[PDB]
């Protein structure tokens, strides 16, 4: 109905948009690698979404220049944990920050 807005739970970022297409992931990771950051993968059950530290899968891909490898390890964590989020994080080594933090898969 209009106009009544129901409170919606999004995780941190990119939540308000529908799930990203395969090509959206492609240019997003292209940007994150073009910035010189370090791709990093996380995953948790939806119950422990608020927890400060998630679970690595497997290690931060330091010094990776090929785009055909990370797009293959994003689905391995999903198939291994079909009830878990798949968060993709960018590690900023110089300033010890994180310039990109968006969840790829919401979790079946």
């Amino acid at each position: 109905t209009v106009g009544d807005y129901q409170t919606v739970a999004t995780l941190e970022t990119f939540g308000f948009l529908p799930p990203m297409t395969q090509d959206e992931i492609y240019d997003q990771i292209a940007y994150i690698i073009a910035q010189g950051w370090s791709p990093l993968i996380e995953h948790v059950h939806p119950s422990r979404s608020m927890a400060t530290y998630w679970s690595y899968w497997k290690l931060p891909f330091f010094g990776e220049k090929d785009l055909g490898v990370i797009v293959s390890e994003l689905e391995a964590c999903h198939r291994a944990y079909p009830d878990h989020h798949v968060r993709l994080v960018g590690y900023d080594a110089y300033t010890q920050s994180q310039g990109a933090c968006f969840v790829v898969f919401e979790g079946r």
Partner: protein, 445 residues
């Protein structure tokens, strides 16, 4: 006493010196060298008189001298004055003393018509004594767990009139729509219709009640400015007992002494501090009188505060070259010299953390494509009526802003021109958002 000992064309400033730039306009016909020396004398020592006591001290070491003379480009009667000062003149870790020493008296001297301080070269020896930001940008993001996007903010309207319950009712609706900050206005310190002890406790329930329903960490600036530091620290402690994450303070109207007092209190207590630049247009607005806001930006970053207003974005303060001139000084660790952006000195901060650049002043939905292309992701956007001005209420409007910015950034990382394809990124996002579909229709275009 005819000076020219304050005008030394051969001196090379030491790396521990504190340099300054005065855009000075002198009297008619006087030599340009004399007025710079007079400016140096009245801002450092104000001497020589005819006094016996003025020989007890070798004044050649303490006197601040002008070492370089330049003219402002495009104008004749004015000029640029560069002066060197020893580090011994200022108290360590004190910002109140340096302002009193530099601009405290030289303005009142009658031989100047228009004077303006532009930039300062802070030496590392003085920087390392100042407290600096309590948290910084990266630590703020790590503590609040928000990465890769500019934050959101809103200003509660109406400012005056809402009691404790209605204020909490209003802030609760804005928080549950996608926003993560709400700003207690500068007008609200303690009013007869709404005391702080009632506003503090009821905004605590609204923040915590909507926090769990959204799954994100939210905050609300509480105005803790007071007429006395004893009362102000009481509000700070009451905010701590409620567990709020971030507080607010007015530094120009509260004094650098109180601003530093709050800055050293938050670090020992682990809170984030917000700063409002009230009364700033009195000193900064005119181009030949007062002090540039860049000087105040450097002094604020040294004094403390994790978030400072930049403004005013209607449609922008302008010029963009000038705003980015002191925005880099608020975020970077080393800012090179540039006359186009007005960086007169090679400013190095070493390992001092930066401060967020806050943009506010009535942003509406079509300003997002241009707002992010200049401020970047290390910024906070604070609307006046952008959230509340939605016909469906103040809760649905927040989703209209959150959806608009997320499409904006997601278009920025994709290599698109956000500032150029504004309509193509705003309309296609409205296809998956009915609230944005009407929000884009309201504040057209």
């Amino acid at each position: 006493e005819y000076r020219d000992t304050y005008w030394t064309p051969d001196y090379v400033p030491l790396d521990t010196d504190l340099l300054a730039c005065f855009k000075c306009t002198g009297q008619e016909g006087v030599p340009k060298e004399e007025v710079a020396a007079a400016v140096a004398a009245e801002s450092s020592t104000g001497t020589w008189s005819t006094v016996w006591s003025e020989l007890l001290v070798d004044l050649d070491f303490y006197k601040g001298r002008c070492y370089r003379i330049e003219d402002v480009p495009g104008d004749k009667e004015a000029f640029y004055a560069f002066i060197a000062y020893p580090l011994d003149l200022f108290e360590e870790g004190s910002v109140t003393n340096v302002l009193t020493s530099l601009v405290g008296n030289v303005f009142g001297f009658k031989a100047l018509r228009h004077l303006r301080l532009e930039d300062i070269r802070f030496p590392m020896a003085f920087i390392k004594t100042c407290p600096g930001p309590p948290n910084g940008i990266c630590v703020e993001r790590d503590r609040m767990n928000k990465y890769g996007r500019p934050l959101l903010g809103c200003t509660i309207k109406p400012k005056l009139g809402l009691s404790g319950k209605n204020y909490g009712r209003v802030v609760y609706e804005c928080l549950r729509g996608g926003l993560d900050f709400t700003k207690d206005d500068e007008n609200i310190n303690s009013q007869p219709f709404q005391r702080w002890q009632n506003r503090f406790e009821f905004v605590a329930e609204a923040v915590a009640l909507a926090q769990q329903e959204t799954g994100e960490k939210k905050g609300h600036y509480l105005n803790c400015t007071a007429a006395t530091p004893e009362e102000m620290y009481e509000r700070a402690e009451f905010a701590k007992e409620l567990g709020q994450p971030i507080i607010m303070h007015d530094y120009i109207t509260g004094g650098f002494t109180a601003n530093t007092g709050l800055s050293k209190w938050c670090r020992k207590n682990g809170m984030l501090l917000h700063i409002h630049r009230a009364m700033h247009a009195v000193i900064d607005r005119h181009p030949k009188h007062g002090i540039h806001f860049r000087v105040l930006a450097k002094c604020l970053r040294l004094s403390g505060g994790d978030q400072l207003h930049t403004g005013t974005v209607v449609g922008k303060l302008e010029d963009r070259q000038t705003t980015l001139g002191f925005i880099d000084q608020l975020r970077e660790s080393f800012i090179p010299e540039d006359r186009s952006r007005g960086n007169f000195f090679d400013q190095d901060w070493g390992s001092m953390p930066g401060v967020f650049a806050v943009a506010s002043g009535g942003i509406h939905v079509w300003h997002m494509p241009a707002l992010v292309a200049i401020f970047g992701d290390d910024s906070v956007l604070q609307f006046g009526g952008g959230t509340h001005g939605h016909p469906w209420g103040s809760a649905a409007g927040a989703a209209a802003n959150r959806v608009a910015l997320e499409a904006c950034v997601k278009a920025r990382n994709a290599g698109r021109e956000i500032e150029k394809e504004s309509r193509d990124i705003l309309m296609e996002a409205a296809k998956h958002s009915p609230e944005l579909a009407i929000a884009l229709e309201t504040w057209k275009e």
